[PDB]
């Protein structure tokens, strides 16, 4: 029992200087070796403290005091290691795709999937280390696998031109039906639906057939630029916040 401890003491001193050959806090590394020393001797006097050590059932409740504290103390670290395993088998996202969550803020493209953490580059090219325990408790969304991007807008006419809203919501709908960048078999809704406090709004809701974020914005720009002069083909001219003033 003592020569086993002697072999592993010099073995972890080899490990200690193998930490010091890397650049890693040599003053601190001896504290780490002291921690490993006292924990392996306490797990051995927990195990083999009945051949030579005394009061068996007393060390049973001593280990029950200690191990329960260790168990619910490092709960989240082992949960990070466990849910990292479930990311290794049931991977809900690949490497090169941006993910998102409506609960937390983890938005960005994945770069590597570690065991404890998961490195995600943001859209500012900053790395963001996410613990894997979120990935078994929040609703991860994967817009990397998005099949169509979506344009969506209210229009907001000037609230006195209510007689003209029918031909506007007809012309915008038929323009979006004949636009080459817009999908046709997806949803396509141009309808007067909101009735706001300053403007008659027109919901415009459709999908482009590309998911590339460059031509999507160009298609959205061209669609809005056609919406504007469809509105100003007739006399509509949008709307501002538009209060009245009732001066004394």
Q: How far is the CB of 215 from a second copy (least distance, A)?
A: 10
Q: How far is the CB of 10 from a second copy (least distance, A)?
A: 22
214 vs 207: CA distance, rounded Å: 15
Q: How far is the CB of 182 from a second copy (least distance, A)?
A: 14
3-state secondary structure at position 113: strand
Q: How far is the CB of 198 from a second copy (least distance, A)?
A: 7
**DSSP H stretches of helix in the chain:** 2-21, 26-47, 56-73, 75-89, 165-177, 215-231
Q: How far is the CB of 111 from a second copy (least distance, A)?
A: 11
Q: Show me where the chain is broken: residue before each gap, C-N > 2.5 A.
A: none
Q: How far is the CB of 201 from a second copy (least distance, A)?
A: 10
Q: How far is the CB of 14 from a second copy (least distance, A)?
A: 17
As given in the structure block, the two tokens for residue 69 are: 């504290």
Cβ closer to a second copy: 48 or 184?
48
35 CB-side CA count, 13 A: 6
As given in the structure block, the two tokens for residue 102 are: 């409506």
131 vs 99: CA distance, rounded Å: 15
54 vs 59: CA distance, rounded Å: 8
236 vs 232: CA distance, rounded Å: 6
Are residues 172 and 204 in contact, defined by beta-carbon separation less than 8 angstroms?
yes
Q: What is the CA radius of gyration of the chain?
A: 32
């Amino acid at each position: 029992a003592v020569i086993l401890t002697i072999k592993l003491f010099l073995l972890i001193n080899q490990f200690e200087k193998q930490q010091i050959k890397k650049g890693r806090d040599i003053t601190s590394a001896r504290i780490m070796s002291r921690i490993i020393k006292i924990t392996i001797i306490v797990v051995l006097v927990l195990l083999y403290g009945e051949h030579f050590g005394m009061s068996l059932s007393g060390l049973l409740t001593f280990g029950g005091i200690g191990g329960l504290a260790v168990g619910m103390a490092g709960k989240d670290i082992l949960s990070n290691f466990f849910s990292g395993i479930m990311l290794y088998f049931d991977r809900p996202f690949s490497i090169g795709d941006w993910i998102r969550s409506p609960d937390r803020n983890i938005e960005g493209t994945v770069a590597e999937i570690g065991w404890r953490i998961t490195k995600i580059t943001t859209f500012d090219n900053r790395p963001l280390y996410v613990p894997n325990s979120l990935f078994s408790s929040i609703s991860v969304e994967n817009p990397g696998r998005m099949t169509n991007r979506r344009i969506t807008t209210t229009i907001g006419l000037r609230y006195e031109d209510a007689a003209k809203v029918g031909v506007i919501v007809e012309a915008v709908r038929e323009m979006l039906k004949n636009h080459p960048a817009i999908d046709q078999r997806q949803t396509l809704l141009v309808y007067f639906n909101q009735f706001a406090d300053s403007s008659l709004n027109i919901m415009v809701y459709c999908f482009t057939k590309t998911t590339v974020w460059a031509e999507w914005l160009a298609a959205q720009q061209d669609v809005y630029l056609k919406i504007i002069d469809i509105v100003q083909s007739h006399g509509a001219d949008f709307a501002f916040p538009s209060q009245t003033l009732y001066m004394d």
